[PDB]
Amino acid sequence: RICFNHQSSQPQTTKTCSPGESSCYNKQWSDFRGTIIERGCGCPTVKPGIKLSCCESEVCNN
């Protein structure tokens, strides 16, 4: 699996996940500086106040 791993609206970058990892994620939250969108491999656990979206297809997390 290959997932996007760039932050927000910055230029696209991708990452090849560990073998057997089938998910990608999109996490979004706000902080004192602005709105952040983090992307990566896997499907992390839900943390309060953070929006999370997981998908299981190639570069599915834009």
Do residues 41 and 57 touch, judged by C-beta distance below 8 A?
A: no
* CB proximity list for 44: less than 8 A, separation 6 or greater: 25, 27, 52
Q: How far apart are CA 59 and CA 48, in angstroms?
A: 26
From which experimental method does this structure derive?
X-ray
Q: What are the residue boundaries of the structural domains of the chain, listed by start?
A: 1-62
Q: Could you please report the per-residue DSSP string of the chain?
A: -EEE---TTSPP-EEE--TT---EEEEEEEETTEEEEEEEES-PPP-TT-EEEEE-STT---
Q: How far apart are CA 25 and CA 15, in angstroms?
A: 12
What number of other Cβ atoms are within 10 A of residue 44's Cβ? 14
Domain at 1-62, CATH homologous superfamily: CD59 (2.10.60.10)
Do residues 39 and 59 touch, judged by C-beta distance below 8 A?
A: no
Cα–Cα distances in angstroms (integers) from residue 53 to residues 32, 39, 49, in the given order:
22, 10, 13
- What distance separates the 2 farthest-apart alpha carbons in the chain? 36
